[PDB]
Amino acid sequence: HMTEYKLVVVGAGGVGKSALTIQLIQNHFVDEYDPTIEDSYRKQVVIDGETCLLDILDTAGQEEYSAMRDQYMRTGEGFLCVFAINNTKSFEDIHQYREQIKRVKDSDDVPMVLVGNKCDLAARTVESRQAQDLARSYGIPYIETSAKTRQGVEDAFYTLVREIRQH
Amino acid sequence: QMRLPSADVYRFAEPDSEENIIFEENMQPKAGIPIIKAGTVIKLIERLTYHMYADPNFVRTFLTTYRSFCKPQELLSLIIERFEIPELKRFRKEYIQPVQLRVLNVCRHWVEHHFYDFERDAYLLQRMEEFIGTVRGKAMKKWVESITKIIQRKKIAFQSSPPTVEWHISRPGHIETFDLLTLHPIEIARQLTLLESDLYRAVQPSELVGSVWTKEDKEINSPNLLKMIRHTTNLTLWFEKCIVETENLEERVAVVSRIIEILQVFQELNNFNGVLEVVSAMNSSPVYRLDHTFEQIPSRQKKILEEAHELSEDHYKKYLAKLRSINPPCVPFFGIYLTNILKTEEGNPEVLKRHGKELINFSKRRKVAEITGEIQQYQNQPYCLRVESDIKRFFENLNPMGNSMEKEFTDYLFNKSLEIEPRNPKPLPRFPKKYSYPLKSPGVRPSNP
Ligand SMILES: Nc1ccc(S(=O)(=O)NC(=O)C2CC2)cc1
Numbered sequence: 001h002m003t004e005y006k007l008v009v010v011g012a013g014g015v016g017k018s019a020l021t022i023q024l025i026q027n028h029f030v031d032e033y034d035p036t037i038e039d040s041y042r043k044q045v046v047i048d049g050e051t052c053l054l055d056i057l058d059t060a061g062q063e064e065y066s067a068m069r070d071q072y073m074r075t076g077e078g079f080l081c082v083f084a085i086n087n088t089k090s091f092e093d094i095h096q097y098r099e100q101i102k103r104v105k106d107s108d109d110v111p112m113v114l115v116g117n118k119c120d121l122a123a124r125t126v127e128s129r130q131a132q133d134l135a136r137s138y139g140i141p142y143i144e145t146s147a148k149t150r151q152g153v154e155d156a157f158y159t160l161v162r163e164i165r166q167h
Numbered sequence: 168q169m170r171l172p173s174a175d176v177y178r179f180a181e182p183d184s185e186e187n188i189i190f191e192e193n194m195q196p197k198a199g200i201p202i203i204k205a206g207t208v209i210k211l212i213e214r215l216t217y218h219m220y221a222d223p224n225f226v227r228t229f230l231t232t233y234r235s236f237c238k239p240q241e242l243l244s245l246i247i248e249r250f251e252i253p254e255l256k257r258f259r260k261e262y263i264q265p266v267q268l269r270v271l272n273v274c275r276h277w278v279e280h281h282f283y284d285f286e287r288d289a290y291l292l293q294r295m296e297e298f299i300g301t302v303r304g305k306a307m308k309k310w311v312e313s314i315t316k317i318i319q320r321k322k323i324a325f326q327s328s329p330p331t332v333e334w335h336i337s338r339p340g341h342i343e344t345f346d347l348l349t350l351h352p353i354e355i356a357r358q359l360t361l362l363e364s365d366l367y368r369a370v371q372p373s374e375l376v377g378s379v380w381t382k383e384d385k386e387i388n389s390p391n392l393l394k395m396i397r398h399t400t401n402l403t404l405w406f407e408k409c410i411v412e413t414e415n416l417e418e419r420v421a422v423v424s425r426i427i428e429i430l431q432v433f434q435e436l437n438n439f440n441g442v443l444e445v446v447s448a449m450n451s452s453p454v455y456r457l458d459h460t461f462e463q464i465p466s467r468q469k470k471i472l473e474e475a476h477e478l479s480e481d482h483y484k485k486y487l488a489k490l491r492s493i494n495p496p497c498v499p500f501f502g503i504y505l506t507n508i509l510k511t512e513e514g515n516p517e518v519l520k521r522h523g524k525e526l527i528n529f530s531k532r533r534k535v536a537e538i539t540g541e542i543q544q545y546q547n548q549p550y551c552l553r554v555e556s557d558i559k560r561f562f563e564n565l566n567p568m569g570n571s572m573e574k575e576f577t578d579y580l581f582n583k584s585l586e587i588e589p590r591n592p593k594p595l596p597r598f599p600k601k602y603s604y605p606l607k608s609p610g611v612r613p614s615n616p
């Protein structure tokens with residue numbers, strides 16, 4: 001069968017993290033979403049000419065269940081570490097998220113992508129250069145996305161699949 | 168067809184159109200009534216108090232979810248306006264009398280199931296009592312007296328014998344000695360199921376609608392949900408702590424094994440929250456890696472643990488099928504509902520536009536009310552188990568983290584794991600025993616009829 005990539009979305013709650021995966025799955029012209037069905041987290045895509053299936057785990061809203069992340073992180077092949085560009089605490093939380101992923105995977109080289117999400121018209125507090133520097137210090141890619149326009153969404157997920165393929 | 172007033176004098180008389188109201192292709196399954204997809208607030212208010220028929224499903228949904236698109240104060244104004252209605256004999260009996268009674272049914276349902284709106288805004292209740300006073304008629308006297316009686320009640324806020332409380336090393340009243348291995352594994356599981364069952368039952372829809380447990384005021388708006396998530400996290404951390412602080416391998420195998428017994432009783436009781444607290448502790452970074460410990464665990468317990476783990480796998484596919492196949496009493500895992508509510512609210516637009524006119528997306532709200540209804544269906548049935556006040560207080564007061572912060576404590580558990588079972592190739596050290604009492608389990612079979 002075609003390759004199935006199991007992806008995990010990690011990040012602070014309260015800052016629109018869920019828009020990343022919702023926007024990917026729903027067509028750029030459809031807006032009626034049901035998270036109760038299998039098609040809402042599974043998507044067949046073609047990346048660099050190679051067809052594959054993305055299985056995306058986003059537990060958005062379960063951030064208080066802080067002792068359940070390791071179970072989710074161990075199965076995951078690749079991670080999207082998401083923060084909101086209008087929320088510095090969400091940017092600062094990334095370090096512990098990456099650390100937990102390394103601890104669970106028992107590796108310093110885990111397929112990972114840092115994602116800066118523009119979740120609303122409120123003022124930007126995290127500048128792209130700060131995020132690019134953070135990403136370079138971890139040795140991972142940085143991608144900014146817009147929750148409103150779908151810009152950067154496909155690049156965030158595709159960049160991660162390329163990170164897994166080159167692992 | 169009846170003759171209704173002009174929109175200039177009565178906004179609710181404006182006729183239906185694609186610019187003010189839209190419907191789903193299907194009908195209410197048990198009622199044959201159309202399902203509203205979207206409409207203007209005036210049109211949603213019209214259909215909430217419709218003259219042709221009563222729509223209890225819409226009333227229930229609307230009152231649970233309206234606060235995103237209409238303030239309580241605005242809703243009361245709209246329903247007062249709807250009641251104040253400006254051939255004449257049939258209009259009084261087929262439009263005015265039904266509508267005025269449906270407005271009072273809405274008032275009655277609001278004060279009964281969503282009194283928090285009145286508790287939070289004393290002026291809202293001032294206006295409800297004022298409006299309810301101005302209602303005159305023999306047809307309404309019965310419904311006006313019911314509303315008043317519900318208000319005053321709200322303002323001044325069953326089986327056979329349960330099984331015998333199980334005891335192991337600690338005897339009744341000896342709280343000082345209570346611990347994971349000294350209390351009976353059946354009783355740990357029963358008392359935790361009782362605590363978790365009451366924590367689950369206390370979560371109200373007002374803590375969920377609008378995803379308010381994720382917002383800055385989550386501590387004000389979702390206190391019961393947060394106490395339930397915190398208990399759960401605490402029990403998982405306590406299980407991990409019990410394991411990794413048992414440095415002696417034989418004693419640690421006894422600890423892991425006793426926890427897998429507690430899980431078995433959680434499974435028998437349909438306490439899925441408890442099952443997942445155990446699975447979460449077993450799959451944590453400090454515990455997962457204890458290969459020398461799990462090697463000594465009986466195959467029966469590995470198999471019990473392995474099947475409990477599988478409930479979580481593949482987006483809770485097996486868990487969901489299992490929860491759907493059982494009937495109360497049970498304690499569901501709340502996290503799935505939280506993700507589903509959040510994603511429904513963030514993945515669907517607040518408004519639909521038709522011919523350049525904004526319509527409140529009511530379907531999005533219905534979907535949320537369907538999730539909140541599924542939570543409530545498991546909140547009615549209690550467990551036929553007796554409370555043991557001391558074991559209850561023991562679990563309510565568990566504080567594994569002490570004064571440490573999350574990172575500091577979690578780093579400590581992991582460093583303890585590395586000390587008791589170092590990474591290969593480092594050999595396995597030996598550690599002295601810490602338990603003066605016997606490590607043999609009494610088992611999970613109830614020791615009494
Ligand atoms: N993409 C992905 C990542 C992890 C998994 S899991 O089976 O480890 N856990 C879950 O599904 C948890 C949510 C139940 C599956 C798919």
Ligand SMILES: Nc1ccc(S(=O)(=O)NC(=O)C2CC2)cc1
Nearest residue numbers: 330353432435436611612613616
């Ligand atoms: N293994 C087991 C299964 C069920 C339970 S119980 O507390 O739900 N019911 C009983 O004890 C019945 C026998 C009285 C406890 C342990």
